[PDB]
Amino acid sequence: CSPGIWQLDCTHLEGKVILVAVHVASGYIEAEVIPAETGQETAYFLLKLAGRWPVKTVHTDNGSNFTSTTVKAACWWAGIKQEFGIPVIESMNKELKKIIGQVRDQAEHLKTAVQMAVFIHNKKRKGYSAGERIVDIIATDIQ
Amino acid sequence: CSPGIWQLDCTHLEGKVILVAVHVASGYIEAEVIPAETGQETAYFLLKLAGRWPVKTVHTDNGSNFTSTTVKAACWWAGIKQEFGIPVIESMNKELKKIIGQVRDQAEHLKTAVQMAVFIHNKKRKGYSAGERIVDIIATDIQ
Ligand SMILES: Cc1ccc(-c2c(C)c(-c3ccc4c(c3)NCCO4)c([C@H](OC(C)(C)C)C(=O)O)c(C)c2NS(C)(=O)=O)cc1C
Numbered sequence: 338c339s340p341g342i343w344q345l346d347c348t349h350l351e352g353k354v355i356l357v358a359v360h361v362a363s364g365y366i367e368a369e370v371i372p373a374e375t376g377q378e379t380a381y382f383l384l385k386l387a388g389r390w391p392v393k394t395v396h397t398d399n400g401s402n403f404t405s406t407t408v409k410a411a412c413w414w415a416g417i418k419q420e421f422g423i424p425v426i427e428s429m430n431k432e433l434k435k436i437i438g439q440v441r442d443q444a445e446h447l448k449t450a451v452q453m454a455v456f457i458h459n460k461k462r463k464g465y466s467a468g469e470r471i472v473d474i475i476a477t478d479i480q
Numbered sequence: 481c482s483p484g485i486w487q488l489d490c491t492h493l494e495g496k497v498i499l500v501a502v503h504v505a506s507g508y509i510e511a512e513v514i515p516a517e518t519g520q521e522t523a524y525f526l527l528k529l530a531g532r533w534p535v536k537t538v539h540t541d542n543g544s545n546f547t548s549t550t551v552k553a554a555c556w557w558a559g560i561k562q563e564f565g566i567p568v569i570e571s572m573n574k575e576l577k578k579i580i581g582q583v584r585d586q587a588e589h590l591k592t593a594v595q596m597a598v599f600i601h602n603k604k605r606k607g608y609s610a611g612e613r614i615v616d617i618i619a620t621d622i623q
């Protein structure tokens with residue numbers, strides 16, 4: 338239900354790493370292919386994300402993802418807090434993968450298919466779409 | 481005033497290319513550093529953008545940016561239309577640059593400074609922030 342809560346995880350496909358962020362209340366996602374599963378990539382990603390949406394806290398299924406100096410710096414600067422599992426489910430990474438499989442032949446590069454999958458997932462009404470729900474959640478929260 | 485209209489342009493700083501997209505009604509921006517000023521980069525960018533926001537039409541100050549087969553394909557797939565200048569102002573690229581200059585020492589890489597600049601610009605209340613205005617514009621348009 339909370340407006341600023343996001344979940345961030347890496348998956349793998351085709352020998353490559355996909356970083357997936359989910360806005361938990363809405364199910365809206367942002368994902369991209371990253372060259373390697375490093376702190377640098379995660380830090381840059383978080384900075385982009387924070388600039389675009391209100392990101393108040395981030396949860397993850399791999400806490401170690403967040404130990405890098407580099408990630409800590411991005412969360413410090415953007416003012417993001419961790420939500421520890423120390424501290425309800427998802428399997429979006431399966432759903433995303435499903436859509437990625439459906440569109441895969443439409444593109445050469447996996448990264449391209451991923452963006453196609455994100456678009457499709459975000460716009461799928463089923464009731465609003467996730468894209469509609471996140472703005473409605475954010476707008477309501479504002480006013 | 482229209483909800484789906486975006487403006488897209490490349491600028492240069494430090495020998496590098498920054499692609500800047502503006503949501504015209506709100507002044508909200510997304511920007512990133514791209515390795516080169518090519519159709520491939522623009523096409524991928526548009527695909528990301530379309531997945532995240534309702535992108536109905538895109539305007540540009542360099543029409544030739546949109547001639548590549550690659551861009552045409554991304555606009556075809558995402559269903560984006562061009563708005564020809566054939567066919568009110570901006571200078572965001574100056575404002576962005578200004579903010580980029582202010583934060584530049586905070587980061588090593590220009591790309592990092594850019595994301596910092598985007599965040600700052602989007603959250604600057606001055607009245608809502610641009611970030612607030614785009615969601616309010618989008619939500620209202622939905623319902
Ligand atoms: C004559 C011709 C011109 C362009 C493409 C092409 C296209 C259309 C796309 C292409 C562009 C936009 C698209 C799609 C493919 N697929 C659907 C969504 O929008 C892509 C995609 O890579 C980028 C450009 C997205 C980085 C790809 O991964 O397939 C790639 C990699 C393409 N190949 S290209 C020209 O070497 O970049 C193919 C041909 C046969």
Ligand SMILES: Cc1ccc(-c2c(C)c(-c3ccc4c(c3)NCCO4)c([C@H](OC(C)(C)C)C(=O)O)c(C)c2NS(C)(=O)=O)cc1C
Binds near residue numbers: 381411586
């Ligand atoms: C011990 C140490 C550890 C990390 C960094 C560092 C940081 C903190 C940042 C860094 C990370 C997050 C940040 C900032 C810098 N600046 C403010 C916003 O959040 C960056 C930025 O590059 C990436 C990671 C964003 C790709 C950078 O361009 O400066 C870079 C490139 C850094 N350098 S590093 C470790 O080689 O990637 C520096 C030191 C001295």
